[PDB]
Amino acid sequence: TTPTVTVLGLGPMGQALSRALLDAGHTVTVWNRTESKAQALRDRGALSAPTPAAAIAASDLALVNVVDHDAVDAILTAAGDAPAGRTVIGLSSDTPDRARRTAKLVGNVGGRYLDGAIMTPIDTIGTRGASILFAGPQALFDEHRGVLDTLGQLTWVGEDHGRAAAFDMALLDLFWTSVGGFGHALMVARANGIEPSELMPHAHGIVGILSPIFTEVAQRVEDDRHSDASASVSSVASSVRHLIAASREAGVDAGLLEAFRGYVDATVAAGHGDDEISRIASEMTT
Amino acid sequence: TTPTVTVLGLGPMGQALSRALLDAGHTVTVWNRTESKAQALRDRGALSAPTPAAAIAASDLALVNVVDHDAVDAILTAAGDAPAGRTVIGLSSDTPDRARRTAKLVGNVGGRYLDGAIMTPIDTIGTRGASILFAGPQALFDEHRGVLDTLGQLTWVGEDHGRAAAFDMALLDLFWTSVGGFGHALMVARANGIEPSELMPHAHGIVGILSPIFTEVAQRVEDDRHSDASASVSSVASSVRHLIAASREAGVDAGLLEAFRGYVDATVAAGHGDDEISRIASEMTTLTR
Numbered sequence: 151t152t153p154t155v156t157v158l159g160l161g162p163m164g165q166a167l168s169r170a171l172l173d174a175g176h177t178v179t180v181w182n183r184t185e186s187k188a189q190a191l192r193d194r195g196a197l198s199a200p201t202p203a204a205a206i207a208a209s210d211l212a213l214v215n216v217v218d219h220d221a222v223d224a225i226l227t228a229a230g231d232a233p234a235g236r237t238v239i240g241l242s243s244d245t246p247d248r249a250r251r252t253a254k255l256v257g258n259v260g261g262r263y264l265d266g267a268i269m270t271p272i273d274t275i276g277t278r279g280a281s282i283l284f285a286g287p288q289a290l291f292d293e294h295r296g297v298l299d300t301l302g303q304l305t306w307v308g309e310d311h312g313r314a315a316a317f318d319m320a321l322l323d324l325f326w327t328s329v330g331g332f333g334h335a336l337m338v339a340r341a342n343g344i345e346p347s348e349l350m351p352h353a354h355g356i357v358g359i360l361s362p363i364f365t366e367v368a369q370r371v372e373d374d375r376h377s378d379a380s381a382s383v384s385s386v387a388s389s390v391r392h393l394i395a396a397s398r399e400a401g402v403d404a405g406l407l408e409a410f411r412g413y414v415d416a417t418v419a420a421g422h423g424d425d426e427i428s429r430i431a432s433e434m435t436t
Numbered sequence: 437t438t439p440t441v442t443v444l445g446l447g448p449m450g451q452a453l454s455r456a457l458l459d460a461g462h463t464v465t466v467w468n469r470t471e472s473k474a475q476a477l478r479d480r481g482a483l484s485a486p487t488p489a490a491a492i493a494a495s496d497l498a499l500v501n502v503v504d505h506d507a508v509d510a511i512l513t514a515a516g517d518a519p520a521g522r523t524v525i526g527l528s529s530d531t532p533d534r535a536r537r538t539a540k541l542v543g544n545v546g547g548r549y550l551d552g553a554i555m556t557p558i559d560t561i562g563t564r565g566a567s568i569l570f571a572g573p574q575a576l577f578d579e580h581r582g583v584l585d586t587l588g589q590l591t592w593v594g595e596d597h598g599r600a601a602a603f604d605m606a607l608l609d610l611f612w613t614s615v616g617g618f619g620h621a622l623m624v625a626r627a628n629g630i631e632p633s634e635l636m637p638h639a640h641g642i643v644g645i646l647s648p649i650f651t652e653v654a655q656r657v658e659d660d661r662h663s664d665a666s667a668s669v670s671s672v673a674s675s676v677r678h679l680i681a682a683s684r685e686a687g688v689d690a691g692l693l694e695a696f697r698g699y700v701d702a703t704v705a706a707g708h709g710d711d712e713i714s715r716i717a718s719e720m721t722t723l724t725r
């Protein structure tokens with residue numbers, strides 16, 4: 151009558167997943183390599199299991215939320231034949247080939263596998279603000295959607311077990327590159343007498359322009375249409391040099407902007423200085 | 437009564453500025469090094485002037501919107517004494533020390549100077565979605581704010597003529613780094629059979645999580661508070677390796693992520709793997725600790 155779910159991995163995100171499943175009223179079994187991280191959840195109604203095999207054998211569905219697929223696959227090695235007749239969902243960020251290999255590891259012991267990628271922070275889990283992408287057999291996603299729906303908005307992205315991970319590689323590239331730019335910006339600003347609290351209203355303004363700019367860049371890349379520029383490659387080839395000089399003056403490394411400059415300069419050298427900045431990423435090939 | 441404004445520089449942003457000032461009912465004079473670029477604005481009601489001196493002498497306020505301060509200073513040199521008794525606003529992105537240099541060039545010929553930085557794209561200009569930062573004498577900003585308010589939301593950031601540029605250097609760093617990430621992401625997604633149109637709903641979701649994350653990282657940096665992590669440095673140290681491997685496999689250079697990894701790895705090596713990702717940027721220093 152009541153669905154069973156196991157969560158293996160009780161770092162910040164695995165705690166968040168466990169609390170959401172417990173609030174939904176599922177029977178939740180938890181396991182972590184560092185055992186005592188389960189204690190806060192046992193106080194909230196979770197059941198612990200002492201080993202990965204015992205944890206997976208307790209439920210129809212096991213979610214594995216750990217640092218990477220070396221950790222996932224180590225947990226599956228320890229679990230042995232426990233996945234047989236059960237479903238494993240990988241929720242551990244790694245490459246598409248690791249998601250496919252882990253699918254194979256689970257199938258070769260008689261389990262079924264979905265791969266997922268959580269694209270939102272812990273505060274969002276258990277709300278309509280969370281976004282989780284899934285890949286693998288459509289029917290298996292449909293079979294477990296009822297339990298998984300309490301976690302957030304789910305999107306199935308394809309049959310290929312690696313496809314959620316492929317989205318994750320692209321989306322986390324955008325995310326972490328932006329985070330690197332933000333932390334750099336705060337360092338250089340602070341060296342110029344602008345504390346983070348004073349910058350932040352304006353930094354929110356920059357975040358506010360990204361969606362419409364990205365929409366246009368994506369459309370231009372699909373159209374292969376880089377003409378009629380509103381902001382040219384030659385203009386940013388001038389600007390990025392200023393930004394690097396400012397970094398240098400402040401004693402802050404400029405490696406992200408230096409990499410960017412290399413692409414911009416290669417676009418100018420290729421004869422596309424007059425084109426929209428949608429052209430620059432072409433020069434990232436090699 | 438009717439305000440007089442000159443725009444010097446008719447690239448895409450100078451055209452946008454000029455259209456917004458004309459749409460507001462101002463008396464707009466325009467000048468560009470390449471004179472043919474003035475025709476569409478003359479049809480909208482702009483006056484054109486043949487030289488920078490004649491352009492600046494036509495108006496109480498001159499906006500200079502060109503690629504950099506080497507171009508600004510070449511235009512103001514050509515204008516000679518035309519700025520005397522008038523106000524020049526630089527709207528051309530460059531360093532704080534170039535903004536201060538240009539301020540002194542204007543003051544040398546008896547003009548007044550504000551430096552400004554436009555922080556939004558051409559479509560926003562003339563709307564409440566635009567943002568322009570200004571630096572220089574507060575009273576001079578106040579004198580011209582009624583004309584300038586037709587371009588967008590305005591922020592005066594202080595009396596030092598370099599200070600709008602200092603914000604610009606920080607904010608464009610964030611912006612272009614993010615654009616570099618985005619263009620890279622599209623190329624790696626395409627190699628993996630995900631076209632830009634299929635990625636974009638999800639990319640908008642990532643943009644949607646940045647502001648609260650940035651607000652937290654800024655508070656932690658101010659507080660020097662990197663503990664009780666919800667996303668640890670050790671975790672991103674693993675993640676960024678995956679990202680770089682995926683770039684390699686797609687035939688795409690991973691320079692930006694490689695640079696980030698070096699900071700992440702240095703933070704782990706400093707014994708801060710369990711800390712929040714707010715700690716990473718410390719390792720960007722090139723100063724002796």
Ligand SMILES: NC(=O)C1=CN([C@@H]2O[C@H](COP(=O)(O)OP(=O)(O)OC[C@H]3O[C@@H](n4cnc5c(N)ncnc54)[C@H](OP(=O)(O)O)[C@@H]3O)[C@@H](O)[C@H]2O)C=CC1
Pocket residue numbers: 159160161162163164182183184187215216217218220221224225241242243244268269270271272666667668670671675
């Ligand atoms: N935190 C977040 O906001 C988000 C996280 N994610 C993803 O969720 C996953 C988990 O993230 P998060 O909770 O932050 O934690 P981490 O990525 O820091 O992973 C820590 C967890 O992995 C376990 N682990 C590490 N190595 C091994 C191993 N060899 N064997 C067994 N378990 C191991 C840890 O066990 P122990 O406690 O014993 O050290 C702990 O449970 C990651 O893949 C991350 O990318 C996705 C979106 C957001």
Ligand SMILES: NC(=O)C1=CN([C@@H]2O[C@H](COP(=O)(O)OP(=O)(O)OC[C@H]3O[C@@H](n4cnc5c(N)ncnc54)[C@H](OP(=O)(O)O)[C@@H]3O)[C@@H](O)[C@H]2O)C=CC1
Pocket residue numbers: 380381382384385389444445446447448449450468469470473501502503504506507510511527528529530554555556557558
């Ligand atoms: N486009 C945008 O969305 C935004 C632009 N900005 C800033 O606004 C400024 C203008 O941007 P944008 O319109 O895109 O154009 P560009 O940065 O490409 O600059 C082009 C303008 O500069 C002029 N110019 C270049 N070199 C010289 C020179 N030596 N002497 C005289 N004029 C010269 C060009 O003249 P000519 O026509 O004869 O070549 C043209 O008018 C830049 O500093 C930019 O960073 C700010 C926010 C957004």
Ligand SMILES: CCCC[C@H](CC)CO
Pocket residue numbers: 268269270271322325649666667713
């Ligand atoms: C600092 C929070 C990071 C969450 C992010 C979600 C895409 C990466 O794991």
Ligand SMILES: CCCC[C@H](CC)CO
Pocket residue numbers: 363380381427554555556557608611
């Ligand atoms: C691609 C449009 C670029 C606008 C940007 C505004 C901060 C930089 O000039």
